[PDB]
């Protein structure tokens, strides 16, 4: 029934809001708080390692929130441990990149980072100009689409609940959940006259994979660097 679909939509939105670190209202409010040129130079002078240490700690923190998101989804806990993990491995980082568009401000090309917004220059110490620049462009594109909270919640749900991931044991159960999500999302897109938006999405697979690699590089080589 139509009412049943709506229960699913509200439920997915509930769980997404519950597992966002800051409420979207708060992110928008704090757009005004902007790093001064001196604070920017503060970050720019840090060592490569220190900057990646901080960045990876935040990448990690976001992934954990994405895991919480999955826990609160309708059929996800019912899946076997193997499946829960397979889906999170394949999709968690991509979810993190989508959730990031919320914290990006398109007006001034700046991003929430550790209490205040600042530009791309804030991350010079990381050294990976091509990668950082791409993460900015990706977020810029998503912002241009003006995804609402509901659209992000449902789309990120579908990023996780994908039935074609190699390694899944209970493929059918996962199809059941994915199909119900595509049903609810399709209905929501129809009522809001937003059917075409998913065509406009920029590709996120290569980018998320690079972020995962950087996160892993830091865990592997921690003994070579200072205690944290």
């Amino acid at each position: 029934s139509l009412t049943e679909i709506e229960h699913l939509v509200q439920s997915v939105c509930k769980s997404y809001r519950e597992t966002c670190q800051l409420r979207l209202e708060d992110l928008l409010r704090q757009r005004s708080n902007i790093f001064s040129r001196e604070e920017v130079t503060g970050y720019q002078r840090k060592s490569m390692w220190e900057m990646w240490e901080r960045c990876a700690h935040h990448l990690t923190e976001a992934i954990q929130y994405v895991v919480e998101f999955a826990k609160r989804l309708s059929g996800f806990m019912e899946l076997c441990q193997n499946d829960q993990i397979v889906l999170l491995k394949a999709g968690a980082m991509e979810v993190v990149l989508v959730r990031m568009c919320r914290a990006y401000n398109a007006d001034n090309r700046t991003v929430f980072f550790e209490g205040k917004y600042g530009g791309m220059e804030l991350f010079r110490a990381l050294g990976c100009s091509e990668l950082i620049s791409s993460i900015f462009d990706f977020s810029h594109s998503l912002s241009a689409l003006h995804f609402s909270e509901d659209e992000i919640a449902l789309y990120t749900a579908l990023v996780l609940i994908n039935a074609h991931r190699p390694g899944l044991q209970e493929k059918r159960k996962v199809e059941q959940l994915q199909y119900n999500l595509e049903l609810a999302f399709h209905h929501h897109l129809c009522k809001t006259h937003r059917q075409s938006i998913l065509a406009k999405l920029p590709p996120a697979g290569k980018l998320a994979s690079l972020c995962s690699q950087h996160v892993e590089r830091l865990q592997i080589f921690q003994h070579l660097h200072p205690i944290v």
Binding site: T60, I63, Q64, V67, E68, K71, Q81, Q84, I85, L88, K89, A92, M93, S209, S212, Q213, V215, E216, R217, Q219, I220
Partner: peptide
């Protein structure tokens, strides 16, 4: 990625 997996396992349990 195995690094990602470690974070996820811990978070789940």
């Amino acid at each position: 990625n195995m690094g990602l997996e470690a974070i996820i396992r811990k978070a789940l349990m």
